[PDB]
């Protein structure tokens, strides 16, 4: 309610993936909450990698963005309006859980932030009319844009993600990967 808190839990199935739950102050006006402080959450990235980049992704119902990643970028991801099927893919070839995945259904009603290490596939599906997706990026030097990221097809038969659609709205990048 009053003092800022975070519950932090490692994924039981994907090493290095973390589920962060903030508390909220709630009254008749709505809610206040802290998505991030340096003091509480800077330790979940290795020495002198700093979250230094904040992005919003506004998406319509049935949009699916993914599956995207790169070797530089730690991501802290949540949904601050509406609802998403957030799916993290293990893309580490050395990992026992290579090309396995974990889904989190994230909304203000279940306000979780997911921490992905680098070399992980990031994706989400918008299950609400509209969604606002918030994420913090931690990386050294220059942002890795689309041409330098990898792409796996949302419906890659090796990964076999459970999505609640057969007909998602996709970018040409995310269609090409099919």
Q: Note whether 5 binds a second copy by CB under 8 A.
A: no
160 binds ligand GDP (CB under 6 A): no
* 125 a catalytic residue: no
**Which of these segments, 10-18, 27-35, 67-75, 150-158, binds a second copy (CB under 8 A)?**
27-35
* Site for ligand GDP contains 103 (CB under 6 A): no
Nearest CA-CA partner of 72 in 141, 128, 134, 133: 141
**Binding string to ligand GDP for residues 53 to 82, with x set by CB under 6 A, is what?**
--x-x-------x--x--------------
Q: Annotated catalytic, 68? A: yes
Q: Which residues pair with 126 in a beta bridge?
A: 84
Contacts of 86 (CB under 8 A, 6+ apart): 77, 79, 103, 104, 105, 106, 114, 123, 124
What is the C-alpha separation between 160 and 136, in angstroms, rounded? 27
Kindly state the smallest distance separating residue 166's Cβ from a second copy, in Å.
Answer: 17
For residue 69, give the 3-state DSSP assignment.
strand
Phi, psi angles (nearest 5°) of residue 148: -100, -5
Confirm or reject binding of residue 50 to a second copy (CB under 8 A): yes
Least Cβ distance, residue 59 to a second copy (angstroms):
4
Could you tell me if residue 28 is left (phi over 0), alpha (psi between -120 and 50 degrees) or otherwise beta? alpha
136 binds Cl ion (CB under 5 A): no
Placement of tokens 């259904």 in the chain = 105
Enumerate binding residues for ligand GDP (CB under 6 A): 1-2, 4, 23-25, 32-34, 55, 57, 65, 68, 145-146, 171, 173
* Residues in binding site for GDP: 23, 29, 34, 55, 65, 68, 145, 173
């Amino acid at each position: 309610h009053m003092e800022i808190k975070f519950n932090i839990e490692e994924s039981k199935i994907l090493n290095g993936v973390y589920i962060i739950t903030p508390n909220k102050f709630s009254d008749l006006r709505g809610d206040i909450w802290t998505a991030f402080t340096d003091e509480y959450l800077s330790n979940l990235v290795p020495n002198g990698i700093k979250f230094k980049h904040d992005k919003f992704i506004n998406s319509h119902f049935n949009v699916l963005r993914g599956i995207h990643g790169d070797v530089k970028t730690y991501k802290l991801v949540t949904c601050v309006y509406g609802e998403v099927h957030q799916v993290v893919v293990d893309c580490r070839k050395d990992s026992p859980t290579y090309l396995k995945w974990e889904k989190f259904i994230i909304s203000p009603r279940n306000q979780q932030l997911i921490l992905l290490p680098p070399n992980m596939g990031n994706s989400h599906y918008v299950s609400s009319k509209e969604a606002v997706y918030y994420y913090k990026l931690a990386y050294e030097g220059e942002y890795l844009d689309a041409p330098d990221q990898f792409t796996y097809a949302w419906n890659d038969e090796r990964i076999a993600i459970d999505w609640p659609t057969n007909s998602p709205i996709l970018s040409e990048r995310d269609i090409l990967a099919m």
